[PDB]
Coordinates of C-alpha atoms and ligand atoms in Angstrom, one line a residue:
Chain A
X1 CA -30.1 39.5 12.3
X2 CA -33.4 38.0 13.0
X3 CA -35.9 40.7 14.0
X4 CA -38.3 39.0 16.9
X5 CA -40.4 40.0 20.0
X6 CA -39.5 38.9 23.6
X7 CA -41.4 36.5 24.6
X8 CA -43.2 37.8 27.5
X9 CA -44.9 39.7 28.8
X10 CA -47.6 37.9 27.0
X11 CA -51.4 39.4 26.5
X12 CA -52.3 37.9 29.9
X13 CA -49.3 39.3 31.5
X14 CA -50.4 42.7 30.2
X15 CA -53.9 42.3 31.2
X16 CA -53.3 41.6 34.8
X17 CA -50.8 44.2 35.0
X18 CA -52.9 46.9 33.8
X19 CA -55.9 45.1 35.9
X20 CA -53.4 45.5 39.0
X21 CA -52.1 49.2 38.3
X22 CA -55.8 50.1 37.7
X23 CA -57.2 48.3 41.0
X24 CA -54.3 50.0 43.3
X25 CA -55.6 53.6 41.6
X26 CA -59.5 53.0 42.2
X27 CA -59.4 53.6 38.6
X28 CA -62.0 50.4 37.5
X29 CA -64.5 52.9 37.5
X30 CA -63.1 55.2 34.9
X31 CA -62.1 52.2 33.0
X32 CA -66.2 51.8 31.3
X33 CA -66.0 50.0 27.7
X34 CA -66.3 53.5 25.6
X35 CA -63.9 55.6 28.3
X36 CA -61.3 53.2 27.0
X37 CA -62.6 52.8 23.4
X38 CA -62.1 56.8 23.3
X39 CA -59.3 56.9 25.5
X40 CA -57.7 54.1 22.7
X41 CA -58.2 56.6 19.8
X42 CA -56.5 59.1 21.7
X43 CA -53.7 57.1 21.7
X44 CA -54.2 56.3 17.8
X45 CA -53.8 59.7 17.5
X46 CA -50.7 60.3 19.2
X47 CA -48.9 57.4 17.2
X48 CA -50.2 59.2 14.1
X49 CA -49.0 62.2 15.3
X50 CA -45.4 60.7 14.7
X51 CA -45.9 59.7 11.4
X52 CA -47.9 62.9 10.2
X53 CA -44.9 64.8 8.8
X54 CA -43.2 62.2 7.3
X55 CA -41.7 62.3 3.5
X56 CA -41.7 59.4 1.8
X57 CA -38.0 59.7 0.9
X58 CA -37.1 60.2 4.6
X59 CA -35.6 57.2 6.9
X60 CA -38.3 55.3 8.1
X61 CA -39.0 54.2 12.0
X62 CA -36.2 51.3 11.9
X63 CA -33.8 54.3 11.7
X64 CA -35.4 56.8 13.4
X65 CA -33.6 58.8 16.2
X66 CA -33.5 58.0 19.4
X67 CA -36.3 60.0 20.8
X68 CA -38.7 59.1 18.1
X69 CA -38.1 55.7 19.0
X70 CA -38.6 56.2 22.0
X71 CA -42.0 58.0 21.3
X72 CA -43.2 55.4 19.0
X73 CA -42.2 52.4 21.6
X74 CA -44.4 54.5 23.9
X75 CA -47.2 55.0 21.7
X76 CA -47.4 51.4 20.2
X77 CA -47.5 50.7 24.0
X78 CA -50.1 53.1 24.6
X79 CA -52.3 51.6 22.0
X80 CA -51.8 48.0 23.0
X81 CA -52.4 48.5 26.8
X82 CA -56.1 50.4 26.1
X83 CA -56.7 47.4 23.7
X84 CA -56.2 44.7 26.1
X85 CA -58.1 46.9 28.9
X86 CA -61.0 47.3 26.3
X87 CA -60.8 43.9 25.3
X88 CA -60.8 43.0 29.0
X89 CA -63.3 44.7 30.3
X90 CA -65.5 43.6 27.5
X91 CA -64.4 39.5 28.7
X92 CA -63.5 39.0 25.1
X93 CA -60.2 36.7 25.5
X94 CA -58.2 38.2 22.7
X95 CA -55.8 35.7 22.0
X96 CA -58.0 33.1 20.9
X97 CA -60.2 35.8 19.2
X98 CA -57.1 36.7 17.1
X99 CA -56.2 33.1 16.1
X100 CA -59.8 32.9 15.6
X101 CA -59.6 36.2 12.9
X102 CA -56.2 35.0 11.5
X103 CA -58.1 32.0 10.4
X104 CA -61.1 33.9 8.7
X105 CA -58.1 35.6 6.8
X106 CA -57.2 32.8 6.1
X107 CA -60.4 32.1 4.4
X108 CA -61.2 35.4 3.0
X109 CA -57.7 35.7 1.4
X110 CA -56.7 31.9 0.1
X111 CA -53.0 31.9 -0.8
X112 CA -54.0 31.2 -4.6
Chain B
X1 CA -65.6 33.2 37.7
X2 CA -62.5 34.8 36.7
X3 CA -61.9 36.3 33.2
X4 CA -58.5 35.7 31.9
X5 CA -57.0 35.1 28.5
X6 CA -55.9 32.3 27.2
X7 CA -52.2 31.9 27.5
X8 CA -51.3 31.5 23.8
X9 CA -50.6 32.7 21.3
X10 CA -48.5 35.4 22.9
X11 CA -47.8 38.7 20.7
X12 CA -44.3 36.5 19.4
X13 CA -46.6 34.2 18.0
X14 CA -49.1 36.3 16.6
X15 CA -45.9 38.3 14.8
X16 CA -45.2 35.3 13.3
X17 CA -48.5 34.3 12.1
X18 CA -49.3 37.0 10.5
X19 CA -45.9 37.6 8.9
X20 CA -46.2 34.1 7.5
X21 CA -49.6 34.9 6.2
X22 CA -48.2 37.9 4.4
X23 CA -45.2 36.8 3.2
X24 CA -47.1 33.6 1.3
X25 CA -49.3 36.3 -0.2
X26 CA -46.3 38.6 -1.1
X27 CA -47.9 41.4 0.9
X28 CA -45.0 42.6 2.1
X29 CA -45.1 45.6 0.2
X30 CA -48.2 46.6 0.7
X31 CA -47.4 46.5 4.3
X32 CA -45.2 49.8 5.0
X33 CA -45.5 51.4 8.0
X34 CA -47.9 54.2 6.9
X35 CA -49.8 51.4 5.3
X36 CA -50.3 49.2 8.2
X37 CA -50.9 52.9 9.9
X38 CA -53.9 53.8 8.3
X39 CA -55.5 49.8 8.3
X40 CA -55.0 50.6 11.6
X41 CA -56.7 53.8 12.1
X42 CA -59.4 51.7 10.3
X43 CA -60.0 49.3 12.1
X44 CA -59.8 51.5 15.5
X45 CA -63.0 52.9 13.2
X46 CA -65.2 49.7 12.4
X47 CA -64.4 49.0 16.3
X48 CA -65.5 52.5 17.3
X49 CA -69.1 51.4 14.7
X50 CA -70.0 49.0 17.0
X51 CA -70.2 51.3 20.2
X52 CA -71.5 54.8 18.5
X53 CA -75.0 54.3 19.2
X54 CA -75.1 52.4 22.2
X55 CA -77.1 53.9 25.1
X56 CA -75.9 54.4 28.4
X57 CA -78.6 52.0 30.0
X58 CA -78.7 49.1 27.9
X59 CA -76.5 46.1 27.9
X60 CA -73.0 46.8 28.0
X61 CA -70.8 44.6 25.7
X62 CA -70.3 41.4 28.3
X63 CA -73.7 41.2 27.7
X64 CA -74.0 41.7 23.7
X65 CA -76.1 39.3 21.7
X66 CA -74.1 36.6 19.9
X67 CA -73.7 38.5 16.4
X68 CA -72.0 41.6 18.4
X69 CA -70.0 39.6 20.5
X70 CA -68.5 38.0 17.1
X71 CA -67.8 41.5 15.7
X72 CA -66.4 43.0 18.8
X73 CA -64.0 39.9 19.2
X74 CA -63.4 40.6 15.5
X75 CA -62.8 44.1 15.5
X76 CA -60.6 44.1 18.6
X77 CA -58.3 40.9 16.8
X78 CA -57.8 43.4 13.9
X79 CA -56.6 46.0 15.9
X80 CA -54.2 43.9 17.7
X81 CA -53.3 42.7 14.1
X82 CA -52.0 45.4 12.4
X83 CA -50.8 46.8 15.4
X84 CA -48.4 43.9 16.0
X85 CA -47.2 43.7 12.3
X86 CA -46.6 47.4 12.6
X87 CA -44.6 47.5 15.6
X88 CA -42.6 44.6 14.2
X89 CA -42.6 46.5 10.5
X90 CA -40.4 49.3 12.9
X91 CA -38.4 46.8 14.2
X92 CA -40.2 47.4 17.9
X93 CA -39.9 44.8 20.8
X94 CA -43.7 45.0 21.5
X95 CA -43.8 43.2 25.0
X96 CA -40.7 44.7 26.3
X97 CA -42.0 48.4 24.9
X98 CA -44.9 47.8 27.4
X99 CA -43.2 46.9 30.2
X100 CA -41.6 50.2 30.0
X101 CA -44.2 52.2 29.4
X102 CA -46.5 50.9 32.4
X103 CA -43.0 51.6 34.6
X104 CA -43.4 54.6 33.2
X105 CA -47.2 55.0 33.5
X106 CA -46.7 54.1 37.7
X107 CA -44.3 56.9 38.0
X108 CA -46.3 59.5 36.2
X109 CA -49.2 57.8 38.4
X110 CA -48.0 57.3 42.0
X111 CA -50.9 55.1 43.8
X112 CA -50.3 57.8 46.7
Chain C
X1 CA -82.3 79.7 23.3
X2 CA -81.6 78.4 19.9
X3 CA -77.9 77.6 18.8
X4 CA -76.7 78.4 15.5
X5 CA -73.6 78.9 13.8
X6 CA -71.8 82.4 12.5
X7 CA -72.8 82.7 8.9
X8 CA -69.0 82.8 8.3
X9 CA -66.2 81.6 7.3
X10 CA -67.5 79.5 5.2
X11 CA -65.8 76.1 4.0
X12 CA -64.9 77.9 0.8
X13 CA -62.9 80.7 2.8
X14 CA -61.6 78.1 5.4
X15 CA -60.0 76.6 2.4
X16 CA -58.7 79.6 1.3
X17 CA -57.4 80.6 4.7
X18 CA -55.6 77.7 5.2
X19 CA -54.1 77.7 1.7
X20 CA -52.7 81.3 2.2
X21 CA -51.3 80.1 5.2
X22 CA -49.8 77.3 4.2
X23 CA -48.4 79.0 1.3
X24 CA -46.8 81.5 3.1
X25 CA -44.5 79.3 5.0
X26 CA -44.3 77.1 2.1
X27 CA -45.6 74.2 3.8
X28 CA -47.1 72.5 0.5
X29 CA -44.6 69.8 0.6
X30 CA -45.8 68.3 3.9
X31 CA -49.5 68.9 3.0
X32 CA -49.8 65.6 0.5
X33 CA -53.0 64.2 1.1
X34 CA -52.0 60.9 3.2
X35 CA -50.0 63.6 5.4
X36 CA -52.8 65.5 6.1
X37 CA -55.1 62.5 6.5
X38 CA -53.0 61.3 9.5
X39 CA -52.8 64.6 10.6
X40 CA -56.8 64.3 10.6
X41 CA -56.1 61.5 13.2
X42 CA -54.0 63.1 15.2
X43 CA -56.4 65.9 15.6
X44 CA -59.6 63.2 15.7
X45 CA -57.3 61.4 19.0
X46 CA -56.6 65.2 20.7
X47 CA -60.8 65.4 20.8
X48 CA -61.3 62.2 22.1
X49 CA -58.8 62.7 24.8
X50 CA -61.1 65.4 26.1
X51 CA -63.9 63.2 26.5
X52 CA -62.1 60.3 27.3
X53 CA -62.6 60.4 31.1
X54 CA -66.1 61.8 31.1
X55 CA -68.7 59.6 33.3
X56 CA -72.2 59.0 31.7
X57 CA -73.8 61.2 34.5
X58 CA -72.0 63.9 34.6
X59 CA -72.4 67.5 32.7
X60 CA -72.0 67.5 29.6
X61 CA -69.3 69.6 26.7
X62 CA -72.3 72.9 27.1
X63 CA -71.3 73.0 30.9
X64 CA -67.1 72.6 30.7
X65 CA -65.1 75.0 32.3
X66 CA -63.7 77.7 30.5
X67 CA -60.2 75.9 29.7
X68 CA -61.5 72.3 28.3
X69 CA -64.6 74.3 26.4
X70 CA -61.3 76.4 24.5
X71 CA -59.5 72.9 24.2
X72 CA -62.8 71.5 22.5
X73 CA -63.3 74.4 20.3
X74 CA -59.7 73.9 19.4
X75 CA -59.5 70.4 18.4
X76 CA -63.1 70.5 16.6
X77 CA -61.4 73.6 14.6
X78 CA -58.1 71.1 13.9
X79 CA -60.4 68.7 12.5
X80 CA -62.5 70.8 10.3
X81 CA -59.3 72.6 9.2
X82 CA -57.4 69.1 7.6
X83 CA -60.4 68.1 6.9
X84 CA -60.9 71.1 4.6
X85 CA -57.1 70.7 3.6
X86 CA -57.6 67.2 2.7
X87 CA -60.8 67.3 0.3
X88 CA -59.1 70.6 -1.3
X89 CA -55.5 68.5 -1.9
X90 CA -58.2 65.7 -3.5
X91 CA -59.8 68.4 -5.5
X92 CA -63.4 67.2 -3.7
X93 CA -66.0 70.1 -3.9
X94 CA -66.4 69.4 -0.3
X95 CA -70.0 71.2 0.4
X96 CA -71.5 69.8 -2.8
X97 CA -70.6 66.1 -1.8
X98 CA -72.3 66.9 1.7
X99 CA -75.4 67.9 -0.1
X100 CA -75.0 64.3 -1.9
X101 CA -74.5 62.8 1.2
X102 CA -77.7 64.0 2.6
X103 CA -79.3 62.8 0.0
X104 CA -78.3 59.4 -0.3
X105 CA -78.6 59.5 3.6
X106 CA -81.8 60.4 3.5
X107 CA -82.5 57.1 0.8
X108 CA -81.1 55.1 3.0
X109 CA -83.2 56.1 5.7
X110 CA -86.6 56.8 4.6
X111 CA -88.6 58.4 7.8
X112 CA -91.6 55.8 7.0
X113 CA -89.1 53.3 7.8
X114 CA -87.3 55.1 10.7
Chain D
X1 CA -56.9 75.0 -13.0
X2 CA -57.6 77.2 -9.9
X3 CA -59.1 74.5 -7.7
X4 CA -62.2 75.8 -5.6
X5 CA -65.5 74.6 -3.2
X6 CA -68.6 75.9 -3.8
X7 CA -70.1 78.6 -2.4
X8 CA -72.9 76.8 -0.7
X9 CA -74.0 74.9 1.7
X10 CA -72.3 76.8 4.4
X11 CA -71.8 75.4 7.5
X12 CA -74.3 76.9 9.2
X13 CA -76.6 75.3 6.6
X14 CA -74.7 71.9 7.3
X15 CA -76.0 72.0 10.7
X16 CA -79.6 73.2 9.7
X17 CA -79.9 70.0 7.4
X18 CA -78.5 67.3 9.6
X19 CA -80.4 68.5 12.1
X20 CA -83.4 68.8 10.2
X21 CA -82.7 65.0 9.2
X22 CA -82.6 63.5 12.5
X23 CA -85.6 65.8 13.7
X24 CA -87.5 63.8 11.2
X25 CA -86.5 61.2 12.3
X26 CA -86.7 61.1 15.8
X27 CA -82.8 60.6 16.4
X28 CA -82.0 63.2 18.9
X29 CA -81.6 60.7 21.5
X30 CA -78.6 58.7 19.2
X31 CA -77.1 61.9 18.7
X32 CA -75.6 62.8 22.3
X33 CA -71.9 64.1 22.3
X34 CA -69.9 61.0 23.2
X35 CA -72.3 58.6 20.3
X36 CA -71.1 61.5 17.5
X37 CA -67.8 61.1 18.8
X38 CA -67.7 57.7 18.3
X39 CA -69.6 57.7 14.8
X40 CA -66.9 60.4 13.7
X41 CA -64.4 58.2 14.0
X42 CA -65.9 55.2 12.6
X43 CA -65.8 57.6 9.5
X44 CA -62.3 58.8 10.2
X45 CA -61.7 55.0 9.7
X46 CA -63.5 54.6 6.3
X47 CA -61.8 57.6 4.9
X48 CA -58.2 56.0 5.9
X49 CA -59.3 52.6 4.5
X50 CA -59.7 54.3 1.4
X51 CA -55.7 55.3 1.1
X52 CA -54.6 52.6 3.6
X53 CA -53.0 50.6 0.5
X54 CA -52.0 53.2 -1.5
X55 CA -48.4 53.2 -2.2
X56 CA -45.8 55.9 -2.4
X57 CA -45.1 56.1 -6.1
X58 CA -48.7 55.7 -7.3
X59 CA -51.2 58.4 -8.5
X60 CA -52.8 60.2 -6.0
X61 CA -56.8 61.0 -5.4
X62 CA -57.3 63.4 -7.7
X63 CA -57.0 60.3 -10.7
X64 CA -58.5 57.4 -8.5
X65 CA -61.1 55.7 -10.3
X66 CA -65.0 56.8 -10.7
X67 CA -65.8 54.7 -7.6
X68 CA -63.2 55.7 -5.8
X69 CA -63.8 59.0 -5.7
X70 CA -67.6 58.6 -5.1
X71 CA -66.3 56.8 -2.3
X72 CA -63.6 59.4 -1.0
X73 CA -66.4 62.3 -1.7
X74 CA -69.0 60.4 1.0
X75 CA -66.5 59.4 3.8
X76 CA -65.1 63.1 3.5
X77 CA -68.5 64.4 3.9
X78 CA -69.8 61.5 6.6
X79 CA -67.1 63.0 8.9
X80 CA -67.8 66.7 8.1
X81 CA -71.2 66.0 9.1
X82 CA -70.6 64.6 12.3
X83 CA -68.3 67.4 13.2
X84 CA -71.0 69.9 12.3
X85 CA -73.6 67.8 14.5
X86 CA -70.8 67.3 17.3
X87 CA -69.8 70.6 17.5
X88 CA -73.8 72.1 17.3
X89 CA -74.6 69.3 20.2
X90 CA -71.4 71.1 21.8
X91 CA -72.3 74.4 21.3
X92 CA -69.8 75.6 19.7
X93 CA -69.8 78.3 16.8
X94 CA -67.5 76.6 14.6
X95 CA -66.9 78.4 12.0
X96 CA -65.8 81.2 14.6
X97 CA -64.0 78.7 16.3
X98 CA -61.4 78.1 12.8
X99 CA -60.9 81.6 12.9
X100 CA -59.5 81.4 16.7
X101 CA -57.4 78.7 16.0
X102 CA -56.3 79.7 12.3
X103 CA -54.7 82.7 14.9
X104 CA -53.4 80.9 17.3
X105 CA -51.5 78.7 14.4
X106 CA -50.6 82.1 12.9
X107 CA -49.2 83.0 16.6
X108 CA -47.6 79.2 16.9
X109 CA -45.7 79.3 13.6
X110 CA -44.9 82.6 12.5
X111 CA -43.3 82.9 8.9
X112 CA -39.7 84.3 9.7
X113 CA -38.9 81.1 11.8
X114 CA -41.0 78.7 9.5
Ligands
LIG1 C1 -54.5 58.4 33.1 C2 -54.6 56.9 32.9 C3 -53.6 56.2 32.3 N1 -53.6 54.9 32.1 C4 -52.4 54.3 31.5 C5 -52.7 53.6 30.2 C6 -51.6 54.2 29.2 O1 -50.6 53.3 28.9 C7 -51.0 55.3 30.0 C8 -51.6 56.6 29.4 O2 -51.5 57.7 30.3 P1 -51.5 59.3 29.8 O3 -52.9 59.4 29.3 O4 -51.2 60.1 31.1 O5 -50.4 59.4 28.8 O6 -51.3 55.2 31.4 C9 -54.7 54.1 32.4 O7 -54.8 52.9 32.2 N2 -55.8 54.8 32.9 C10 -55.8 56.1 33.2 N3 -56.9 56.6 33.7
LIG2 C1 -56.3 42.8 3.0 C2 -55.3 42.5 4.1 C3 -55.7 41.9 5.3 N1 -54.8 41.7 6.3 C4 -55.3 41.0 7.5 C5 -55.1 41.9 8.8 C6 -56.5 42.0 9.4 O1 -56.7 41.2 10.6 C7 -57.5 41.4 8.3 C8 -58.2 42.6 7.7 O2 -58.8 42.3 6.4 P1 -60.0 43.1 5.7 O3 -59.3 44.5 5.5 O4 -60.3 42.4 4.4 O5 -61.1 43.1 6.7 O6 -56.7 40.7 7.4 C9 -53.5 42.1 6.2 O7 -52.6 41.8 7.1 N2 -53.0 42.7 5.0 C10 -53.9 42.9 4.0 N3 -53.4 43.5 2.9
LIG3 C1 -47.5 72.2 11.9 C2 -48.6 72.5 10.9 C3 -49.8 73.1 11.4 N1 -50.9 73.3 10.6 C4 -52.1 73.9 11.2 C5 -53.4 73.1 11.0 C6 -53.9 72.9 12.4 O1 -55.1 73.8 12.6 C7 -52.8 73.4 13.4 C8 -52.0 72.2 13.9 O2 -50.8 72.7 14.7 P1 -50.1 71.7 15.8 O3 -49.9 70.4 15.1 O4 -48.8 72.4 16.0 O5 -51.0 71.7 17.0 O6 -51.9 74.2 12.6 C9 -50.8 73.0 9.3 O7 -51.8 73.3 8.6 N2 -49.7 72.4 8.7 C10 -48.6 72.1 9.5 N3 -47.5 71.5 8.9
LIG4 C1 -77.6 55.9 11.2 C2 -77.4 57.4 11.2 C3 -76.9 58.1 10.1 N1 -76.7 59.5 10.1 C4 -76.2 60.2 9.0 C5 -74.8 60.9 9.2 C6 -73.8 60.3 8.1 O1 -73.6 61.3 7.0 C7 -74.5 59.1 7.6 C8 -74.1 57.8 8.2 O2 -74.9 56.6 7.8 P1 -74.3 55.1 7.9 O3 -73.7 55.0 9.3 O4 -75.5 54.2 7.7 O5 -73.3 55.0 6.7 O6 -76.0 59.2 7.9 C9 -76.9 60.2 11.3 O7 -76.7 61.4 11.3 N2 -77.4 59.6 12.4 C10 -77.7 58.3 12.4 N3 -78.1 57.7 13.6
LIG5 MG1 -49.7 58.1 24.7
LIG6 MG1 -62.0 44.8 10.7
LIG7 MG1 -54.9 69.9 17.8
LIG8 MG1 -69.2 56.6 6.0

């Protein structure tokens, strides 16, 4: 069966509802560009973490157990929600800057 | 004026970009999750480059000249990249992962 | 007063060390270079985590409390330690390529030149 | 053949050369805790790109190509150099530090339960 993504929440949805979990905290102020840069590679770290121990001959994360799918959901989620903050709070719209990069990809890799 | 993101493309779409774009490059294998991992970890890196030796009184990065703006919407797109390819590598439902993990994040954080 | 460093262990008997302990639990399986690079990350993201938070104005890592200077020391010693691991599993004479590394850092920034 | 690192430098004399180097050259001010943080990790991230597309089955570092290993030798010691710096700018005695923690991992994983 087809593996997709729901469809939303999209990257705005995401942004607003960190934006309004942040704003009900007073937590704008802890949310400066390198505070969630470093808070981001915390969370880097902890979906490393999952990975770490790994063998190569092991199942891999489409049939891991239930708790470490549950971990790496969190983690992936983790990453993503810092990413849009960052991106965010830096005003870079990062939908259009990521059509705008897979198009330089494009570019920089031509099918060939 | 208020800063939003464009509405499209949503994380769906940017799975399926950028599974097209590998697929017509038969990247597929190079894109295992430990793969997509590390490109991860190093783009998290050449984002991290761009802040390391920024002062705390100059201009913050909604304020960057044009040539770091590009970079920073560059670096943040490849981030968001590889972390959508790998999330759909392990077969996780990226949107839907967040929305439980910000339920999750307003428990462990009542507003209180 | 100036800060300096212990004169040991050096990098040499931090590799040692964590051979011999690695070894005794025969852990050499899980120590394959790509596992001990993420574990590197992991480590790297337990460090940030500690500075995560901090404002620009406030103290700095020298003026912690007790409990988050231990965490730091820690996590600095986590990194150094895969880090060690890591060049060792590569078979890179890890002091001798920092002394390269100076080098050619020092070429690429000549102090004429800033 | 028994694989070791050199003697010297020690990591005391890490942290006398780096920051001999940025004494020179009037870099103190770039060198705050939170901006070798960040650099750290930029090099964390140029040491992963080196194994990022490194299959499973392939050789591993110890046979990468001339280059390769140039390159794998200069990330290794970019990030070992910003440690040392981060962990000097810190304050903390890190090679005392390992020792602490190669205890504590002693005390975390003892060898009759693996
Ligand atoms: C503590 C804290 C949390 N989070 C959110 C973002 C992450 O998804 C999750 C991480 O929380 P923790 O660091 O407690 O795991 O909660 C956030 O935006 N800002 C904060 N100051
Ligand atoms: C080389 C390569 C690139 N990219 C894509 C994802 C990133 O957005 C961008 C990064 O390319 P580079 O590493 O050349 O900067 O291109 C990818 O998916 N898979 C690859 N094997
Ligand atoms: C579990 C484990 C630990 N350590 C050592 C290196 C680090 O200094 C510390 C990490 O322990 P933990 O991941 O449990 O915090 O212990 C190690 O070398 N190899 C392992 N397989
Ligand atoms: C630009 C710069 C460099 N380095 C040193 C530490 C690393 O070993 C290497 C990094 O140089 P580059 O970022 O240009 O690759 O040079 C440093 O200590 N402080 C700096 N402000
Ligand atoms: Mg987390
Ligand atoms: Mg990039
Ligand atoms: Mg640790
Ligand atoms: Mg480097």
């Amino acid at each position: 069966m087809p593996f997709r993504f729901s469809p939303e929440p999209t990257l705005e949805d995401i942004r607003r509802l960190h934006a309004e979990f942040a704003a009900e905290r007073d937590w704008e102020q802890f949310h400066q560009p390198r505070n969630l840069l470093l808070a981001l590679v915390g969370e880097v770290g902890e979906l490393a973490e999952l990975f770490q121990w790994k063998s190569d001959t092991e199942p891999g994360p489409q049939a891991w157990p239930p708790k470490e799918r549950a971990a790496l959901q969190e983690e992936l989620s983790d990453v993503l929600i810092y990413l849009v903050a960052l991106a965010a709070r830096c005003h870079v719209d990062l939908p259009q800057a990521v059509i705008s990069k897979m198009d330089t990809n494009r570019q920089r890799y031509p099918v060939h």
